[PDB]
Amino acid sequence: PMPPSEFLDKLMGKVSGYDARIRPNFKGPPVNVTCNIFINSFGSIAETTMDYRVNIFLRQQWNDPRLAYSEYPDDSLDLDPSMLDSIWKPDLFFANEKGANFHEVTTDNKLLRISKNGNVLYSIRITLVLACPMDLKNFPMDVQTCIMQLESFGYTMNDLIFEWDEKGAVQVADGLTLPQFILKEEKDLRYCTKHYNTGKFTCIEARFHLERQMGYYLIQMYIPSLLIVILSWVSFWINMDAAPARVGLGITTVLTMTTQSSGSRASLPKVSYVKAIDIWMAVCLLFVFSALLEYAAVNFIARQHKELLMRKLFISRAKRIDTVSRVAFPLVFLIFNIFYWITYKIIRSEDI
Amino acid sequence: PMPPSEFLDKLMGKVSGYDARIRPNFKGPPVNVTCNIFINSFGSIAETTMDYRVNIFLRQQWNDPRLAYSEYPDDSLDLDPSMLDSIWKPDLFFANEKGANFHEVTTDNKLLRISKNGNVLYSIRITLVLACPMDLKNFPMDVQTCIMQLESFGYTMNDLIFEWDEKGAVQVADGLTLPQFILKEEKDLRYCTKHYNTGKFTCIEARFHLERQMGYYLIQMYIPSLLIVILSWVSFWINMDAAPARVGLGITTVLTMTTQSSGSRASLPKVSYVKAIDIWMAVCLLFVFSALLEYAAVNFIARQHKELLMRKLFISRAKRIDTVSRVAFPLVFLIFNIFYWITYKIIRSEDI
Amino acid sequence: PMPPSEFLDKLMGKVSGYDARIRPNFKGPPVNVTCNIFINSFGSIAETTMDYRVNIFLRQQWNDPRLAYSEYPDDSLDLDPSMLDSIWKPDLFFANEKGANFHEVTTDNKLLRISKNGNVLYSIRITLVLACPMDLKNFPMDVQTCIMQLESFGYTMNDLIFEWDEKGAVQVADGLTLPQFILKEEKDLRYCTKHYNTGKFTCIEARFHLERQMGYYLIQMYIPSLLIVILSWVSFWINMDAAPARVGLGITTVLTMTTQSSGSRASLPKVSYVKAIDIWMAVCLLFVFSALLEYAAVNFIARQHKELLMRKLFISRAKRIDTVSRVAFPLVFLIFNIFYWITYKIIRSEDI
Amino acid sequence: PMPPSEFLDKLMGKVSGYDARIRPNFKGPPVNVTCNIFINSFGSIAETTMDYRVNIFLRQQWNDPRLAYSEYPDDSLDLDPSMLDSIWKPDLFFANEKGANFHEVTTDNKLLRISKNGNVLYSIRITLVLACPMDLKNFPMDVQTCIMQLESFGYTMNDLIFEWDEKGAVQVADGLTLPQFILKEEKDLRYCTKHYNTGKFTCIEARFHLERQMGYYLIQMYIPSLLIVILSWVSFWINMDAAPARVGLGITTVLTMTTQSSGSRASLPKVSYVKAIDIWMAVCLLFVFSALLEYAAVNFIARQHKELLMRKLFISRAKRIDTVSRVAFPLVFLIFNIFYWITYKIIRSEDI
Amino acid sequence: PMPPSEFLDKLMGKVSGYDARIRPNFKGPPVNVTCNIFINSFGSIAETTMDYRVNIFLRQQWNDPRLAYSEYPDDSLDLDPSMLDSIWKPDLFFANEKGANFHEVTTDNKLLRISKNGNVLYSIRITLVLACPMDLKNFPMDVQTCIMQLESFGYTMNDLIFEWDEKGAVQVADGLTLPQFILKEEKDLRYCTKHYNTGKFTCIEARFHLERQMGYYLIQMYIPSLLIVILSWVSFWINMDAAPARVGLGITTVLTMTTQSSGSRASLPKVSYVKAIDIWMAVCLLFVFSALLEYAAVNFIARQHKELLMRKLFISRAKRIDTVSRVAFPLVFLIFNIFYWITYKIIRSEDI
Ligand SMILES: C=C(C)[C@@H]1[C@H]2OC(=O)[C@@H]1[C@]1(O)C[C@H]3O[C@]34C(=O)O[C@H]2[C@]14C
């Protein structure tokens, strides 16, 4: 019967009165646009610059009174991806976006559909680097919230309003996991608005939730720091007759603790406030230091006993310091370590 | 006789009724497309971000009822690379793709052929960075699987279906080797499918297999860690009369072991679970530590003997600890090292 | 009534006598252009290369005698973003600009408006990397000034003059903070001019003010350096009977101080003059060194007493050095540390 | 007389029967193309990723029966660089190419010439990053071979064959030197061929030769490693009366040797086989270790003599070990160092 | 009177006989082009890859017999930046150029002027990364010469010749300074020529002069190395009675000197020849080593005296070595340090 290319030229082109530079249903209530977001591949989240790489598909549907053929026997039509200028897709930008170039492999990576009523389907895979203002109040637990702000640019609130969907809000790629964080399935979403000096613009957003999968942090720094503290404890028992060995153990244990505390913040961005690591390393450096101090006091009692040679009293005092020291370090460390964990587990359960 | 450019304009252009925006054999069974993949140069695999750089050639053949001249005396025709829009090549994208720009040196790097029946040949060299979800369950052996997902975008299962080839599936560049891994020639391949909220899309894949060429890992960390353990063993024999020297050997051996264990995970991505290196380094740090501990006990027996001066008994006990220690360390290390290797060689042979 | 696309073609196109390649009100006084700057997202400031990444919106208004319809009942019209060549927007470039590519997500990210009189509205989100000549006279306080130079290129002072606005000068994105610096709200602004060998060109600028949010610097280097100094002080009290231990403490404390002083300048760019850190580290390395020196003198008095065995006098002198040393170090350190802070707090209050 | 632009339009355009999409002398023997390569600037060779940056000029000449005016009085004509599509330059790609974008400063950086017979001249400066499979069998000498593979894409052996030149093959930029390697002037060249599954394609290549300019390697690692070995030798002579000092010298010399051996492979790519550095560092670490071992044996003889107090015999044995040790280390090191150099100098002279 | 756009279309377009693809004054003496260079912002000079980033403005003037209106009452006309193809600007490329993309902020960043006679003005801000072959014969002083080679591509010496200017040669941005180097105002300039295998091409150049602003280098490495040497000197005076302490001081001072000498060449590119730093560090490592050696000899005299117990003679010899050592080190260091500075200050004054 009729040719498909003849019908495609009759629908969009010189036969069509619309030039596509005018918004559909002009001088009428703004046409809402439904946006479904599918995450092709989450990951590559940069912690030192507070950003993340994600490619979404951005399928958007709107209705127009134009482009209603109502003469083909099927429900929808799969259009070419070379007719993108005739559709007049709406404007959309991200307000926290870095880079975000398009994709091009053998064609434009775009989808196009059109039904009898005018409901269209237009999805585009775009790799988006987005800046997120993560709050690193506690570095190991580190509940983070990542956002994406779907915003228009040039069409006001009384001209173009975006909206979400009701059958599914944000889908995710099947069988995708992240080593750094586990993606929460809550997918809390809502929408704000913008008030600039030129008008009222719509701003639709979506909030993600990322918690740290603990394990790596413990092996990398919690386990070495612990062993280092343990080494200091053994020093008292390791050396009794000769003092030098204890001195040098305590010196280099403090130096390697400061080296590890300096090396732990290399991947971290520069921030003013104090994290949990910056409490843990400081208190373990306090313990190792304090032990060395205790040692200085023991050598002072020994030097007083040497310059005196009350001999029994001095020996007794030294022995007492030695036997009280070693008993005291585990209880003051165990109570603190357990206390720290409880004071962070209960704030984790209060946050979650 | 007839001019070639006149025939080329008669075949594609104003004389041709097709505009090339319509799929061939429209309102008919989907035209399958045969895909042959040739790897120009594998390599540059990034371990810290789980990706790899590869340039394939992507020769794809399909048949159309149009573009059948049946008037030239030869079988096929070599077309210009400026007539790419007239062919209407099918859409194809990769679902795990980062970047992947085109190549441009003096022309478009594209091939074009057309036969009397309509079987075309279209290959394109594209440098593709693809993200692979490698599982680093054992870091030194590390059997990995890399995939490439040939997928359409805009044409459903009842509109366009891709397929593989039967005379050769994935070819590889002659005389190409990789320092990091040796490419398996098994080339296991199959194809999945996709079910989105818009329709059923085809997804053709191909699985590669990469195992680590062992050697470098052994020289870099297995040999230094071993020597370090050996150094600790010699300490007992190195120093008998004077205790300090043993103390300081054990301290710095533990500190350099923790330094090497911290420096070994710099190229590694942050991951929660425990690798074979994280067992080996932990057990060797246990051995070196344990030796230092044993030493603390020896100095405690020596200090008890000093504060007593049962003298013979104390000397005998110290001698016993010294002679049992040194006998015990090799057997408990050799049995463990051999055990570890057997428990990883048999899981390597069970995986392969 | 009349069609909107017919009116849009009548206003700009073949019906319009202007080709848009001629400046509005040609052979007349230069048309001034009002520029409002909104900072979408400040941050990612590079300290080692003296630059910063910022995306502004750059809304610019000018009046033209052309494009005055005076026939529609509304005040303004929202034009398409495909008619950008018909407006003839003015030239604008930044004189300290690196890179600064455009943005492209589904359309041109541009705004276009036109009123009855001719006052237009044109804003463009452009991610601008700008080079700022920061003066690092004092590294921890580090009051910096960042500038952006709005400059024309091709239109002289008697041809095109830019100007600022009176209802708001530079706006900023609501709820945006920077970890490195806190943005001052003073927003001091003025404008310079340029005199090249081709003519007089306008150059409009805006000055920002960035001070360091102190805290991170103190934890990272001030607290470790302090502890190191404290360790040296304890050495005198730690060891009295045996000299070696003090020697080795002082050696490695000097070596780790030089290591920390070398590692502190890794993020810093290479600069000739002396910062506050380069005074602090040098004076603390002086203190630790001086202590070791004092120690050398004590061992010289001890060796003189040994080669003599005036015995009482030598013992008294050694004791005196030991008791004067330890009293002297805190007062000469506390007076200096307080002095340094006062001499930098008062220059901070004099700068602010 | 006649206008030049009129003649340029008559030669190429609507008057010309060729559309330029057809190969010259179609249905005739393939037109060979002469390729002269000039290296504008060699350098920036990456060792960790096995690639190098080079910009060649790629002047290519071919003859066509068309475009023969034979009416101007001069020999050749210098055409515009905007008429590149009318010439129909042949296809050319590199089979080991990464990136390789074009250059653009104020025009297309292209040359165009045409003579009366039809011999054209077309050169293009293109910065080419090319991957070379260097074999690092011996790291310090390291004779490497870099290749460039000029290959067609779309025109078979019976359609288009490339060839080299006879008056000069590959020229090089005057007064250009490389710090890493000295470019050999031999410039050995030949050509292979390709056999794919679609046809026979020509592949013309050129081989370069790069040897390491020795010196830097010697200062950076050979001289420090030597000094370290020397330090170990002095230890025996440095300490005789007291054993600790020797113990600690040997410990830290082994630790700094392992640190230097770990730090030497940072710029190196990960490779399985053993280089000359990995023999040198291993044998010097063996020497330093062995010395420490010898020392353990001396302390065992000393402890046996202590637990005995045959006294003369034990003292004599210790003295003998001390005097045999120090005599033995230089001869066993000098013979080995000279042997290593001879066994690498003669394989260098056999390779060259 | 007459319209400006009508005159602009009459001057360039269909009324003009020239197509702009032909050089002005064809079959006549080559039109020279005057080039004035203004440096917008020098800086970001990379030392490890021998390059630098600079954006010049490149204002070029040439005369043509065409485009002479001689009918407007003014001297010059400010043309649009959309008519760049009608002017036929000459070709220009840089022979040592990497990257160098164009700038694009709201328009083309180009200037265009035309007078009654035909003298045009065309400037373009282009950020140019240029490779300079710096000779690092002496690393701290380091007089460097940076060049820019203005060269044509496609027009021979008898077709197009570039030239410099007489009223100003290379201008620089007012109030611009560089932390690394101070720009010399001599601005020595001349021009070479090129002789390829296709013809004689013009090549105009300009030489800059960059010397290091000394200060940073001294603080970073000269001051730490000095202190380290000083520490070694104090060792002799620090320890007299006990030998171990001196041994360990000398060991770790040699180890930290080798660490600092290894860490000093990290920013440096790999080069074969010997710099001033590689003499200074080697001679200071010689001094520290030599001191340790001297010490070995002292302990040998002490061990000979111990195995003898000529007693007075041995004590006297040891005392003599101790008192000659300490006197000798400053004079042999001061004479050398002063000598080195004089031998580099006089070669600096001979170079300048
Ligand atoms: C951390 C260092 C470098 C110290 C230094 O002085 C010490 O106390 C540490 C010790 O580890 C430990 C010891 O042997 C070392 C030595 O001789 O000095 C050094 C060695 C290496």
CSV table of N, CA and C and ligand atoms in Angstrom, one decimal, chain A residues 248 251-252 255, chain B residues 248 252, chain C residues 248 252, chain D residues 248 252, chain E residues 248 251-252, ligand 1:
chain,number,residue,atom,x,y,z
A,248,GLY,N,65.2,1.9,72.5
A,248,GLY,CA,65.1,1.8,71.0
A,248,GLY,C,63.8,1.2,70.4
A,251,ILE,N,61.3,4.0,70.8
A,251,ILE,CA,61.6,5.1,69.8
A,251,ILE,C,61.1,4.7,68.4
A,252,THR,N,61.4,3.6,67.9
A,252,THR,CA,61.1,3.2,66.6
A,252,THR,C,59.7,2.8,66.5
A,255,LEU,N,58.1,6.1,66.0
A,255,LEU,CA,58.4,6.6,64.6
A,255,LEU,C,57.7,5.8,63.5
B,248,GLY,N,66.4,-6.1,69.0
B,248,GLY,CA,66.4,-5.1,67.9
B,248,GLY,C,66.2,-5.8,66.5
B,252,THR,N,62.8,-4.7,64.3
B,252,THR,CA,62.9,-4.2,62.9
B,252,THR,C,62.4,-5.2,61.9
C,248,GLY,N,71.4,7.2,69.9
C,248,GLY,CA,70.5,6.7,68.9
C,248,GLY,C,69.1,7.3,68.8
C,252,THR,N,68.0,9.2,65.2
C,252,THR,CA,66.9,8.8,64.4
C,252,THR,C,65.8,9.9,64.6
D,248,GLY,N,73.8,-5.5,63.9
D,248,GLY,CA,73.0,-4.5,63.4
D,248,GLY,C,73.3,-3.9,62.0
D,252,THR,N,70.6,-4.2,58.9
D,252,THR,CA,70.1,-3.0,58.2
D,252,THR,C,70.6,-3.0,56.8
E,248,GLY,N,76.8,2.9,64.6
E,248,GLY,CA,75.4,3.1,64.2
E,248,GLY,C,75.0,4.5,63.7
E,251,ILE,N,76.5,4.3,60.1
E,251,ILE,CA,75.6,3.4,59.3
E,251,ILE,C,74.4,4.1,58.8
E,252,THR,N,73.7,4.7,59.7
E,252,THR,CA,72.4,5.3,59.3
E,252,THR,C,72.6,6.6,58.6
F,1,LIG,C1,64.4,2.9,62.5
F,1,LIG,C2,65.7,3.1,62.4
F,1,LIG,C3,66.3,3.5,61.0
F,1,LIG,C4,66.6,2.9,63.7
F,1,LIG,C5,68.0,3.1,63.5
F,1,LIG,O1,68.4,3.1,65.2
F,1,LIG,C6,67.2,2.3,65.8
F,1,LIG,O2,66.9,2.2,66.9
F,1,LIG,C7,66.3,1.6,64.6
F,1,LIG,C8,66.6,0.5,64.1
F,1,LIG,O3,65.6,0.1,63.3
F,1,LIG,C9,66.7,0.1,64.5
F,1,LIG,C10,68.4,-0.4,64.5
F,1,LIG,O4,69.2,-1.0,63.9
F,1,LIG,C11,68.8,0.0,63.5
F,1,LIG,C12,70.2,1.0,63.6
F,1,LIG,O5,71.4,0.5,63.7
F,1,LIG,O6,69.9,2.1,63.6
F,1,LIG,C13,68.8,2.2,63.0
F,1,LIG,C14,68.1,0.6,63.0
F,1,LIG,C15,67.8,0.1,61.6
